[PDB]
Amino acid sequence: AITADDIAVQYPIPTYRFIVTLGDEQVPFTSASGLDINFDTIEYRDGTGNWFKMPGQRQAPNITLSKGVFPGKNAMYEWINAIQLNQVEKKDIMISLTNEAGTEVLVSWNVSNAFPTSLTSPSFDATSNEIAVQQITLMADRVTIQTA
Amino acid sequence: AITADDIAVQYPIPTYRFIVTLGDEQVPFTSASGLDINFDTIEYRDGTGNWFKMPGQRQAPNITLSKGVFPGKNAMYEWINAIQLNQVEKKDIMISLTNEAGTEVLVSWNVSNAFPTSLTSPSFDATSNEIAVQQITLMADRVTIQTA
Amino acid sequence: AITADDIAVQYPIPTYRFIVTLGDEQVPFTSASGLDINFDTIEYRDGTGNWFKMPGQRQAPNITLSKGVFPGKNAMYEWINAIQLNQVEKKDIMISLTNEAGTEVLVSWNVSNAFPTSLTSPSFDATSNEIAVQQITLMADRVTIQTA
Amino acid sequence: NWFKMPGQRQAPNITLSKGVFPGKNAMYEWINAIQLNQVEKKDIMISLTN
């Protein structure tokens, strides 16, 4: 007698349902990792015995997205190919834990200014049964969490 | 013929039952590790053969707490988001080995001034069957054990 | 009711079917890895709080090809044996994800100026049941992806 | 009797460093305006801030 409207309030959310809004378009991905919030630590000790522990400045997140290779055009390729020595169309990423149908966002992770730093092609092997999966890494500046 | 009132006096305590009082509120967690008491070592040798071994100064504990992601508000997020360059609401953590019902504290671990240094979001994967689990690390200054 | 002409448009491409055009000839290979597009990262921080994150210059790809040892002549050997102190016939490599019959190229990877840097002979073992597999590594300068 | 006394204080030498931006170089425009004695002296304030 849990009456599943109470499951939507009280039970934890699984990981296998997520949408990725990449800039102004939604792109289907398989994995999404590295959306951390990390700080440095500043310490100070004197001779009397006082230890002072403080949070430092937060460093940049390194975000890994991976999807499969499809017969159309490679949208992750034309965004990493258009680099001119420091110039890149920086995009904002949203990764939202989603309802089963896709009509509710439960908890989402916002990424402010992401740009690609790597794009690894799949390893071709004649004795394998796998999908060609590209794996892109992104450099950002902050990760925030909105909960609704 | 052990008469389980003697089990509460003579048998060791398992790990799977613990409450975490985080500041002034109790927050449910899955794991809790890193509540060590570590010292440094100062040594001195002379030519006659005397070795002098001494305890140094005790270093800071690094404490890892991890819980799941729930549909409400993220209480571990608003405590790591409210950082202003060295400023953080430092909290005192109590992790108590508890009775089954929760009406007895067996052995508890006290943590003096804890503040968050990291908050790792879960790794999203479409081929997984897991709970979204956040994992927060804390910087403290001492860990004490009271036994009652 | 997917009507497999729609599979050629909408489903991902597996890895086990690939042709390798090595210069002006096609050579059968077993594996092909390392066809990445990697960038460096340039960062700049000032005292006011501005972080500037930029893509650096893209570094060289290191490409691994491996095939078996055949009773004829070793075509990967006469291309690594003909080195004179900096001189090498640099070749352009194309690795194409292919149809089952071989009459359609789905997505191909182009490699601009590849030359061999290593050629590892197989490990001979009397208690093994394996093919003599050579493994050549190549140094290139760029990797591009054309999708047709 | 040893008599130890502070002397006269000497001049500070302050070094600053910033990055090169595509616009106008404000630090070149202040070191190029030297005419044998004549430089716009400025007040430097370096404040640790929130």
Could you write a compact summary of the structure shown?
By secondary structure, chain A is mainly beta. Chain A has helices at residues 7-10, 77-80, and strands at 18-22, 25-26, 31-33, 37-38, 41-45, 51-55, 62-68, 91-98, 105-120, 124-125, 133-139, 143-147.
Count, helices of chain A: 2
Strand content of chain A: over 45%
Shape of chain A: extended
Question: Helices and strands of chain A, in N-to-C order?
Answer: HEEEEEEEHEEEEE
What is the C-alpha radius of gyration of chain A, as a whole number of Å? Answer: 20 Å
Largest sheet of chain A: 8 strands, antiparallel
Count of β-strands of chain A = 12
Protein name (chain D): Afp1
Keywords (chain D): Plasmid
GO molecular function (chain D): structural molecule activity
Task: Tell me what you see in this structure.
This is part of a larger assembly, with 4 copies of chain A. Chain A has one domain (1-148). In chain A, strand 5 (41-45) and strand 6 (51-55) form a beta hairpin. Chain A contains 2 helices and 12 strands, in the order H-E-E-E-E-E-E-E-H-E-E-E-E-E. The first copy, chain A, starts with 6 loop residues before the first helix and ends with a strand. Chain A is mainly beta and 148 residues long. Chains in contact: A-B, A-C. Chain A binds chain B through residues 8-16, 18, 30-43, 51, 53-55, 57-58, 95, 97, 106-107, 109, 143-145, 147, and chain B through 60, 68-74, 77, 80-81, 83, 85-86, 88, 113, 115-132, 139, 141. It is classed as virus like particle. The entry lists the keywords Anti-feeding prophage, secretion system, AFP, contractile, virus like particle, sheath, tube. Cryo-EM structure of the anti-feeding prophage (AFP) helical sheath-tube complex in extended state. Chains A, B, C, D are Afp1.
